[PDB]
Curated annotation (Swiss-Prot), chain A:
GO biological process: negative regulation of translation; translation
Protein's name according to its UniProt entry: Large ribosomal subunit protein uL13
Summary of subunit composition and partner proteins: Part of the 50S ribosomal subunit. Interacts weakly with proteins L3 and L6.
One GO CC term, this protein: cytosolic large ribosomal subunit
InterPro entries: Ribosomal_uL13, Ribosomal_uL13_bac-type, Ribosomal_uL13_CS, Ribosomal_uL13_euk/arc, Ribosomal_uL13_sf
SUPFAM superfamilies: Ribosomal protein L13
Family classification: Belongs to the universal ribosomal protein uL13 family.
Keyword field: Ribonucleoprotein, Ribosomal protein, RNA-binding, rRNA-binding
Keyword check for Metal-binding: no
Gene: rpl13
Chain's role: This protein is one of the early assembly proteins of the 50S ribosomal subunit. Binds to 23S rRNA.
Molecular-function GO term, any one: structural constituent of ribosome
Provenance organism: Haloarcula marismortui (strain ATCC 43049 / DSM 3752 / JCM 8966 / VKM B-1809) (Halobacterium marismortui)
Cross-referenced Pfam families: Ribosomal_L13
Swiss-Prot record, chain B:
SUPFAM superfamilies for this protein: Ribosomal protein L22
InterPro entries from the UniProt entry: Ribosomal_uL22 (IPR001063), Ribosomal_uL22_CS (IPR018260), Ribosomal_uL22_euk/arc (IPR005721), Ribosomal_uL22_sf (IPR036394)
UniProt entry keywords in alphabetical sequence: Ribonucleoprotein, Ribosomal protein, RNA-binding, rRNA-binding
Keyword RNA-binding: yes
Function: This protein binds specifically to 23S rRNA. It makes multiple contacts with different domains of the 23S rRNA in the assembled 50S subunit and ribosome.
Organism superkingdom: Archaea
GO cellular component, one term: cytosolic large ribosomal subunit
Similarity annotation: Belongs to the universal ribosomal protein uL22 family.
GO biological process assignments: cytoplasmic translation
Organism annotation: Haloarcula marismortui (strain ATCC 43049 / DSM 3752 / JCM 8966 / VKM B-1809) (Halobacterium marismortui)
Protein name per the record: Large ribosomal subunit protein uL22
Coiled-coil stretches: none
Subunit (UniProt): Part of the 50S ribosomal subunit. Contacts the macrolide antibiotic tylosin in the polypeptide exit tunnel.
UniProtKB/Swiss-Prot annotation, chain C:
Gene Ontology cellular component terms for the protein in this record: cytosolic large ribosomal subunit
Biological process terms in GO annotation: DNA repair; translation
Gene name of this polypeptide: rpl32e
Extent of Basic and acidic residues compositional bias: 8-21
Stated role: Binds to the 23S rRNA.
The name this protein goes by in its record: Large ribosomal subunit protein eL32
Length: 142, 150, 142
RNA sequence: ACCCUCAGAAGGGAGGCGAAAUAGAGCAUGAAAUCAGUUGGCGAUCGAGCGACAGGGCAUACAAGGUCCCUUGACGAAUGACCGAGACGCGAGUCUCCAGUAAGACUCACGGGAAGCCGAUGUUCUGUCGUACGUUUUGAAAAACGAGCCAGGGAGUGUGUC
RNA sequence: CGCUCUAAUUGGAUGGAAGCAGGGGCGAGAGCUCCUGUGGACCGAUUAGUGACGAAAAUCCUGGCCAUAGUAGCAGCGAUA
């Protein structure tokens, strides 16, 4: 379905938390943001420990529940929510005006935000969001 | 007792009241609530269907433990309070009777206002175990009715 | 055909530059409600002020948000304290002989509630003739 | 009283008396807790000392309050620039001049505007702060003690001596 | 600051007192005061007195009232009617 975005961000080879922090800041300023190519988004560090943290979040829960997303679609969306006061009116409106996508459903190419890009030629210790999702058990639909 | 809580123009209106009725007040709120807006004749047919058990009265406020009824629309709980329905029929017999005497078409008149008020309790006492006694009271109900021309 | 008030209703006093400055200050600054602690929490506890005596009382200890405690620092300016919002000093009147000595430029008059329609009519006409405004006038059909 | 209704000396309706029946029989007045109906505000995706202070929505017969908004201008405490020019710094940036200038809370004046309009009141939304009250206690939101709610009642008094 | 009754001085009320309900104004505040409705006969102020004079609390007292709830009971017994 259509979503009229003011800003379209390209998450490809970009440090997740840094994109997320900027997308949150913009959503609270009234912008309708759309994060694109989230499967190709990046997160630094040793893969074994990163996956361990995300696997623990999946195993955590009870009857009240702890719904933790396995797909890179929802993982990026949850990362943004943690940077937004989603329980408050202004915060929920900001969050609901942000959507994360697998690939690029638009004709326009996304913009790469400043300070978010990771130089692959300078880094080897990082993981792609899709690689985390495959290890978590999600169905590769990208 | 009570007095009519709503203004009424005598030229286009018929009135009626019930005094110190020993019936359930909780049932009376539910019946009043449901018959309001209906025509006097529609209300008589409705209350007769309740006594027969063919039409349930929605219990929206006093419903703790009340089982669900399929015929209740927009709500779930309901019952068939015959005692208070028979008393409301006496109120509608009086109202339509007062109406016809004034030259109106009683049955066809709209129920503009209908409300039940708890006027008191007929005190009672029930012996319990351990040499103690507790209350066993009967509610005393008043109910006003204002019929109006369509 | 319509209702009209007796006397000089639209009359305003002549105050010095300083007394008008202080009157405008009292009106701007205002003061807090000064209602008793937790009056809103319990019906048996009225709005009337009582000093919070409790050793652990949040209001007594001056916790922010628990309401202002009565202090002398809250007093209105001496030069304007007790004046009617118009700027007039009030004089309570019971009869016609109570209007004597009243300066209609500085003071306005307030007829006591008990005083009946007969005596009120005589007080009102004698007040208008003496150039004194009646704060609580009779509204006659003119 | 009369009439209608009703199983009816009930009750109800209409009617009569009286200044007043909302003075109609435990019948002067008629508070609160609280109940029925109803009005305003909120409301079935959202968080809990229930508020105080700020600021917005919606709501308001009169009376007892009459203020309030916007251009501009005057005054102008502490504070206090942009731009530009000159000069330093690896750099972020800084010093000098412009300048204690423009600005600067309050208050006032001219012109224009508002009367649900300003205040105020009801409710609700946003911001800030906020785990009752009283008592016990070194330490009470306390998993320490008391209260279901309201009204009324409820605790330094007398004599003698010093 | 407020309450009771006494006194002196001095006022208000059937052209509507006290009380009560809702509302306006003042006082840092105790509280004062006005408007409207109700009520239908009493009510103040100042000064000097008087005191069975002020409540949110005491598992406080008495009365009234809500939720609990249209819920438990109206079955169980060698007499199942
Ligand atoms: Cl779970
Ligand atoms: Cl939040
Ligand atoms: Cl690396
Ligand atoms: Cl009941
Ligand atoms: Cl003082
Ligand atoms: Cl000023
Ligand atoms: Cl003492
Ligand atoms: Mg049941
Ligand atoms: Mg016994
Ligand atoms: Mg209260
Ligand atoms: Mg009475
Ligand atoms: Mg201890
Ligand atoms: Mg005197
Ligand atoms: Mg008392
Ligand atoms: Mg105490
Ligand atoms: Mg008791
Ligand atoms: Mg139960
Ligand atoms: Mg048998
Ligand atoms: Na990490
Ligand atoms: Na989980
Ligand atoms: Na149904
Ligand atoms: Na249905
Ligand atoms: Na408001
Ligand atoms: Na204690
Ligand atoms: Na405590
Ligand atoms: Na505790
Ligand atoms: Na009880
Ligand atoms: Sr940012
Ligand atoms: Sr219920
Ligand atoms: Sr009066
Ligand atoms: Sr009558
Ligand atoms: Sr929380
Ligand atoms: Sr200056
Ligand atoms: Sr009432
Ligand atoms: Sr006492
Ligand atoms: Sr009960
Ligand atoms: Sr049996």
């Amino acid at each position: 379905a259509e979503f009229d975005a003011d800003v379209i961000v390209d998450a490809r080879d970009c440090i997740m938390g840094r994109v997320a922090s900027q997308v949150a800041e913009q959503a609270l300023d009234g912008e309708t943001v759309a994060v694109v190519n989230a499967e190709r988004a990046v997160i630094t560090g040793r893969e074994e420990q990163i996956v361990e943290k995300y696997e623990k979040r999946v195993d955590i829960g009870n009857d009240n529940g702890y719904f933790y997303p396995k797909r890179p679609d929802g993982i990026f969306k949850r990362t943004i929510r943690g940077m937004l006061p989603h329980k408050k009116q202004r915060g929920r409106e900001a969050f609901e005006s942000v959507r994360v996508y697998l690939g690029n459903p638009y004709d326009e190419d996304g913009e790469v935000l400043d300070g978010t890009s990771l130089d692959r030629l300078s880094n080897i210790k990082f993981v792609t969001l899709g690689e985390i999702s495959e290890t978590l058990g999600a169905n590769k639909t990208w | 007792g009570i007095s009519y809580s709503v203004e009424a123009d005598p030229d286009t209106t018929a009135k009626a009241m019930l005094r110190e009725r020993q019936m359930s007040f909780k049932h009376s709120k539910a019946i009043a609530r449901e018959i309001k807006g209906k025509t006097a004749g529609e209300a008589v047919d409705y209350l007769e269907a309740v006594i027969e058990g063919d039409q349930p009265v929605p219990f929206k406020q006093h419903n703790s433990g009340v089982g669900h009824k399929s015929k209740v629309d927009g709500w779930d709980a309901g019952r068939y309070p015959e005692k208070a329905s028979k008393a409301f029929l006496d109120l509608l017999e009086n109202a339509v009777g007062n109406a016809d005497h004034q030259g109106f078409d009683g049955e066809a008149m709209t129920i503009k206002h209908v409300a039940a008020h708890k006027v008191g309790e007929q005190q009672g006492r029930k012996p319990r175990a351990m040499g103690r006694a507790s209350a066993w009271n009967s509610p005393q109900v008043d109910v006003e009715l204002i019929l109006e021309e369509p | 055909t319509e209702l009209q008030a007796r006397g000089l209703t639209e009359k305003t006093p002549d105050l010095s530059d300083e007394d008008a400055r202080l009157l405008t200050q009292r009106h701007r600054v205002g003061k807090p409600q000064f209602n008793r602690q937790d009056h809103h929490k319990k019906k048996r506890v009225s709005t009337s002020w009582r000093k919070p005596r409790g050793q652990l009382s949040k209001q007594r200890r001056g916790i922010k948000g628990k309401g202002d405690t009565v202090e002398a620092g809250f007093r209105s300016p001496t030069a304007v304290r007790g004046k009617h919002p118009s700027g007039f000093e009030e004089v309570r009147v019971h009869n016609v002989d109570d209007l004597e000595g009243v300066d209609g430029d500085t003071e306005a008059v307030r007829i006591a509630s008990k005083v009946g329609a007969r005596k009120r009519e005589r007080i009102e006409e004698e007040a208008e003739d003496a150039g004194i405004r009646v704060l609580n006038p009779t509204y006659v059909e003119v």
